[PDB]
Amino acid sequence: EQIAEFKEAFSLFDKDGDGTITTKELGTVMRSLGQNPTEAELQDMINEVDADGNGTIDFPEFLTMMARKMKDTDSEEEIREAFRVFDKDGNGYISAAELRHVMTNLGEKLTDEEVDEMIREADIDGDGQVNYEEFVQMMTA
Amino acid sequence: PLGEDDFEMFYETWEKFDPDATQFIAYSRLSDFVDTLQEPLRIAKPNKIKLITLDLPMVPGDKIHCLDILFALTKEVLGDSGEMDALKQTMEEKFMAANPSKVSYEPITTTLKRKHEEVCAIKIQRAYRRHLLQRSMKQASYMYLTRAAA
Ligand SMILES: [Ca+2]
Ligand SMILES: [Ca+2]
Ligand SMILES: [Ca+2]
Ligand SMILES: [Ca+2]
């Protein structure tokens, strides 16, 4: 198995490169991304992947966390964040434009027809828009 | 070793990566810019992760303003003084009016953001595609299973 890419991720949350991740470094990265964590919340997040009680997180613990998430669980919390990211204007609905714009990004060249089928099968209500409930249903099972 | 020469030198090699004097650079082009830079302000060649961490704002589409790059490179080497923050604001007004070309004032995206969006997007396309394969597989086997029973 290849850990080649997980190092880039570890580097992102390590500002000083001291080989560990504190609350403060993690909080810094979250805030820049658009989310406010409470101080207590940052602590619990740190604890879950904190094997050796240290209070910070080096590549071993980080690697284990990545391995745990390696299974494509596709949890609702993970999905919720994606919705937050794609819902550019924050109105609680993802318009076609928003999602269609995401296709241009590098991850995969979803064809326009493929994207249209994504919208067709997700928009139950029938109003040209994905809300959170439809988006979750589309991505669950 | 910050000096007088470095600032003219930053503004010089801007013409190398932007002869057209657009004052904007495609994000992909940026990594090489900072590699081929003056010694104090230079960032080592493996610099994609740093650029991501810098959060330089990008205007549509994927265009970063001359100043943002500049001040971010200096305040990397140098401390984040209040005067610089004020100085850039004054400079911003001078540059815009000065520019003959006209564009909207605000950019809605930054590199950190962009990297999360690319990550989150991959996760969704990867999941969507896998979900599809499963449906097809299930449909084929079931069809064969019923047909065989018949
Ligand atoms: Ca650290
Ligand atoms: Ca630890
Ligand atoms: Ca929206
Ligand atoms: Ca809807």
Numbering used by the authors:
A (entry chain B): 7 to 147
B (entry chain A): 1611 to 1760
Paper text:
The crystal structure of NaV1.4 CTerm Short (residues 1599–1754) in complex with (Ca2+)4–CaM was determined to a resolution of 3.30 Å (Rwork/Rfree = 24.0/28.5). Crystals belong to the space group P43212 and contain one complex in the ASU. The NaV1.4 CTerm shows the same fold observed in the higher resolution structure with apo–CaM with helix α VI in the same orientation which indicates that this helical rotation is insensitive to CaM’s Ca2+ state. The crystal structure of (Ca2+)4–CaM in complex with NaV1.4 CTerm Short shows that the C-lobe of (Ca2+)4–CaM binds the IQ motif of helix αVI, in a pose similar to that seen in the apo CaM CTerm complex. In this complex Ca2+ binding does not open the C-lobe’s hydrophobic cleft; instead, the C-lobe is fully Ca2+-saturated and yet maintains a semi-open configuration. Unlike in the complex with the apo–CaM, in this complex the C-lobe does not form any salt bridges with the NaV1.4 CTerm although two residues in the CaM lobe linker are involved in salt bridges: Asp78 and Asp80, both with Arg1740. The N-lobe of Ca2+-CaM is found in an open configuration, in contact with the Nav EFL, with a shifted center of mass (3.6 Å shift) and with a reduced BSA relative to the apo CaM N-lobe EFL interface (334 vs. 495 Å2). The hydrophobic cleft of the Ca2+-saturated N-lobe is open, solvent exposed and unoccupied in this structure. Even though the NaV1.4 CTerm construct used here includes the entire post-IQ NLBM previously identified in NaV1.5 CTerm (NaV1.4 residues 1742–1753, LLQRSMKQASYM, 67% identity to NaV1.5), no N-lobe binding post-IQ was observed here.
Voltage-gated Na+ channels (NaVs) rapidly activate upon membrane depolarization to allow passage of Na+ ions into cells. DIV is followed by a C-terminal tail which contains a structural domain (CTerm, NaV1.4 residues 1599–1754) consisting of a five-helix EF hand-like motif (EFL, helices αI–αV) followed by a long α-helix (helix αVI). CaM is a small (148 residue) ubiquitous eukaryotic Ca2+-sensing regulatory protein. NaV1.4 exhibits a unique CaM mediated Ca2+-dependent inactivation (CDI) which results in a reduction of bulk Na+ current by approximately 30% after the elevation of cellular Ca2+ levels to ~10 µM.13 In contrast, NaV1.5 exhibits no CDI even at elevated Ca2+ levels.
